[PDB]
Amino acid sequence: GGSHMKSYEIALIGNPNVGKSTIFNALTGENVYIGNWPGVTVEKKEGEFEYNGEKFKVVDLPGVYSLTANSIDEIIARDYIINEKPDLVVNIVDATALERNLYLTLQLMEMGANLLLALNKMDLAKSLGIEIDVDKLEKILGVKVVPLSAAKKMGIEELKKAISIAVKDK
Protein backbone atom coordinates (compact mmCIF):
# COMPACT_ATOMS: atom_id res chain seq x y z
CA GLY A 1 0.00 0.00 0.00
CA GLY A 2 0.86 3.69 0.19
CA SER A 3 1.27 6.59 -2.22
CA HIS A 4 2.52 6.48 -5.81
CA MET A 5 3.78 9.80 -7.10
CA LYS A 6 3.88 9.69 -10.88
CA SER A 7 7.50 9.98 -11.94
CA TYR A 8 9.40 11.30 -14.94
CA GLU A 9 12.93 11.32 -16.28
CA ILE A 10 14.33 14.38 -17.95
CA ALA A 11 17.77 15.15 -19.33
CA LEU A 12 19.50 18.50 -19.70
CA ILE A 13 21.80 18.96 -22.68
CA GLY A 14 23.49 21.87 -24.43
CA ASN A 15 26.77 23.50 -25.44
CA PRO A 16 29.20 24.13 -22.58
CA ASN A 17 28.82 27.36 -20.62
CA VAL A 18 25.16 27.97 -21.51
CA GLY A 19 23.74 27.80 -17.96
CA LYS A 20 23.15 24.08 -17.67
CA SER A 21 24.63 23.83 -14.18
CA THR A 22 22.84 27.01 -13.13
CA ILE A 23 19.54 25.63 -14.36
CA PHE A 24 20.21 22.22 -12.79
CA ASN A 25 20.90 23.73 -9.36
CA ALA A 26 17.84 26.00 -9.60
CA LEU A 27 15.58 23.06 -10.42
CA THR A 28 16.89 20.52 -7.89
CA GLY A 29 18.60 22.51 -5.14
CA GLU A 30 19.72 20.23 -2.33
CA ASN A 31 18.52 16.89 -3.73
CA VAL A 32 21.60 16.12 -5.79
CA TYR A 33 23.95 13.23 -6.46
CA ILE A 34 27.35 13.93 -7.92
CA GLY A 35 29.37 11.11 -9.43
CA ASN A 36 31.15 10.00 -12.61
CA TRP A 37 29.95 8.31 -15.75
CA PRO A 38 31.18 4.68 -15.66
CA GLY A 39 34.93 4.14 -16.15
CA VAL A 40 35.48 7.78 -16.92
CA THR A 41 36.22 11.12 -15.21
CA VAL A 42 33.31 12.88 -16.86
CA GLU A 43 31.02 14.20 -14.14
CA LYS A 44 27.44 12.97 -13.90
CA LYS A 45 25.03 15.19 -11.92
CA GLU A 46 21.60 13.81 -11.05
CA GLY A 47 18.84 15.16 -8.87
CA GLU A 48 15.10 15.63 -8.64
CA PHE A 49 12.43 18.16 -7.84
CA GLU A 50 8.74 17.86 -7.18
CA TYR A 51 6.17 19.90 -9.04
CA ASN A 52 2.39 19.92 -9.00
CA GLY A 53 2.32 16.54 -7.28
CA GLU A 54 4.68 14.71 -9.62
CA LYS A 55 8.35 13.73 -9.35
CA PHE A 56 10.94 14.82 -11.91
CA LYS A 57 14.32 13.13 -12.16
CA VAL A 58 16.95 15.29 -13.80
CA VAL A 59 20.21 14.13 -15.27
CA ASP A 60 22.74 16.66 -16.46
CA LEU A 61 24.31 15.39 -19.69
CA PRO A 62 27.89 16.35 -20.68
CA GLY A 63 28.09 19.70 -22.53
CA VAL A 64 28.49 19.10 -26.28
CA TYR A 65 28.50 21.10 -29.52
CA SER A 66 27.46 18.15 -31.66
CA LEU A 67 26.27 14.54 -31.31
CA THR A 68 28.66 12.83 -33.66
CA ALA A 69 31.16 10.58 -31.93
CA ASN A 70 34.20 12.83 -31.78
CA SER A 71 34.52 12.62 -28.01
CA ILE A 72 33.42 10.34 -25.22
CA ASP A 73 31.19 13.24 -24.07
CA GLU A 74 29.28 13.06 -27.35
CA ILE A 75 29.16 9.30 -27.18
CA ILE A 76 27.89 9.29 -23.61
CA ALA A 77 25.26 11.93 -24.39
CA ARG A 78 24.06 10.32 -27.61
CA ASP A 79 23.89 6.87 -26.03
CA TYR A 80 21.85 8.30 -23.14
CA ILE A 81 19.38 10.16 -25.34
CA ILE A 82 18.78 7.29 -27.81
CA ASN A 83 19.06 4.33 -25.44
CA GLU A 84 17.91 5.56 -22.02
CA LYS A 85 14.92 7.32 -23.59
CA PRO A 86 14.26 10.21 -21.21
CA ASP A 87 10.66 11.39 -20.97
CA LEU A 88 11.90 14.82 -21.97
CA VAL A 89 15.04 16.38 -23.30
CA VAL A 90 15.49 19.97 -22.18
CA ASN A 91 17.86 21.50 -24.71
CA ILE A 92 19.42 24.50 -23.01
CA VAL A 93 20.40 27.08 -25.59
CA ASP A 94 22.34 30.31 -25.15
CA ALA A 95 20.50 33.25 -26.74
CA THR A 96 23.77 35.14 -27.21
CA ALA A 97 24.98 32.56 -29.75
CA LEU A 98 21.83 31.11 -31.26
CA GLU A 99 23.12 29.94 -34.61
CA ARG A 100 25.95 27.89 -33.18
CA ASN A 101 23.74 26.53 -30.37
CA LEU A 102 21.13 25.34 -32.88
CA TYR A 103 23.56 23.00 -34.64
CA LEU A 104 23.09 20.61 -31.71
CA THR A 105 19.37 21.38 -31.44
CA LEU A 106 18.83 20.26 -35.03
CA GLN A 107 20.50 16.91 -34.48
CA LEU A 108 18.38 16.48 -31.36
CA MET A 109 15.14 17.02 -33.29
CA GLU A 110 16.40 14.76 -36.02
CA MET A 111 16.71 11.96 -33.44
CA GLY A 112 13.07 12.21 -32.43
CA ALA A 113 13.90 13.48 -28.95
CA ASN A 114 10.94 14.75 -26.99
CA LEU A 115 12.31 18.26 -26.92
CA LEU A 116 11.78 21.40 -24.92
CA LEU A 117 13.97 24.38 -25.60
CA ALA A 118 15.17 26.49 -22.67
CA LEU A 119 16.43 29.72 -24.21
CA ASN A 120 18.74 31.00 -21.47
CA LYS A 121 20.74 34.21 -21.01
CA MET A 122 17.92 36.47 -22.30
CA ASP A 123 19.30 39.17 -20.00
CA LEU A 124 22.78 38.90 -21.53
CA ALA A 125 21.34 39.12 -25.02
CA LYS A 126 19.31 42.20 -24.04
CA SER A 127 22.39 43.93 -22.69
CA LEU A 128 24.44 43.07 -25.80
CA GLY A 129 21.74 44.28 -28.16
CA ILE A 130 21.07 40.78 -29.50
CA GLU A 131 17.58 40.39 -30.91
CA ILE A 132 15.72 37.11 -30.72
CA ASP A 133 12.23 36.66 -32.13
CA VAL A 134 11.19 33.91 -29.76
CA ASP A 135 7.91 33.24 -31.58
CA LYS A 136 9.51 32.91 -34.99
CA LEU A 137 11.91 30.50 -33.29
CA GLU A 138 9.16 28.30 -31.83
CA LYS A 139 7.38 28.29 -35.19
CA ILE A 140 10.37 27.33 -37.34
CA LEU A 141 11.70 24.68 -34.91
CA GLY A 142 8.28 23.31 -34.11
CA VAL A 143 9.41 22.94 -30.51
CA LYS A 144 8.27 24.93 -27.51
CA VAL A 145 10.75 27.50 -26.31
CA VAL A 146 10.88 29.01 -22.85
CA PRO A 147 12.92 32.21 -22.48
CA LEU A 148 14.68 32.71 -19.13
CA SER A 149 17.69 34.11 -17.31
CA ALA A 150 18.57 31.41 -14.82
CA ALA A 151 21.42 33.33 -13.24
CA LYS A 152 19.02 36.15 -12.41
CA LYS A 153 16.37 33.66 -11.31
CA MET A 154 13.80 34.70 -13.92
CA GLY A 155 11.79 32.19 -15.95
CA ILE A 156 12.76 29.22 -13.83
CA GLU A 157 9.18 28.74 -12.61
CA GLU A 158 8.01 29.04 -16.23
CA LEU A 159 10.47 26.33 -17.14
CA LYS A 160 9.21 24.07 -14.36
CA LYS A 161 5.66 24.44 -15.64
CA ALA A 162 6.56 23.98 -19.29
CA ILE A 163 8.45 20.83 -18.29
CA SER A 164 5.50 19.30 -16.42
CA ILE A 165 3.47 19.81 -19.58
CA ALA A 166 5.97 18.80 -22.29
CA VAL A 167 6.42 15.54 -20.42
CA LYS A 168 2.74 14.51 -20.73
CA ASP A 169 3.57 14.74 -24.42
CA LYS A 170 5.23 11.34 -24.87
> Binding of ligand GDP at residue 121 (CB under 6 A)?
yes
Binding mask 42-81 for ligand GDP (x = CB under 6 A): ---------------------x------------------
Closest among 74, 49, 46, 67 to 163, alpha carbons compared = 49
**Least distance from ligand GDP to the Cβ atom of residue 168, Å:** 27
Nearest 5°: phi and psi at 100?
A: -65, -35
- Is 25 flagged in the annotation as binding? yes
The residues, any chain, with a CB within 8 Å of residue 115's CB and separated by 6 or more, are: 88, 89, 91, 105, 108, 109, 143, 166
* 110 annotated as ligand-binding: no
69 is in an annotated binding site: no
Is 124 a binding residue for ligand GDP by CB under 6 A? The answer is: yes
Which of 11-19, 47-55, 98-106, 107-115 is the region at the interface with ligand GDP (rule: CB under 6 A)? 11-19
In the range 129-158, which residues lie near ligand GDP by CB under 6 A? 149-152
- Residue 14 marked in a binding site: yes
Task: Give the CA dihedral 152, 73, 15, 18, nearest 10 degrees.
Answer: 10
Q: Report in angstroms the alpha-carbon separations of 91 from 2, 64, 100, 102.
A: 35, 11, 13, 10
Contact 132, 98 (CB under 8 A): yes
Residue 151, marked binder: yes
User: Which residues participate in the annotated binding site for Mg(2+)?
Assistant: 25-26, 28-29
The residues binding ligand GDP (CB under 6 A) are: 16-22, 63, 120-121, 123-124, 149-152
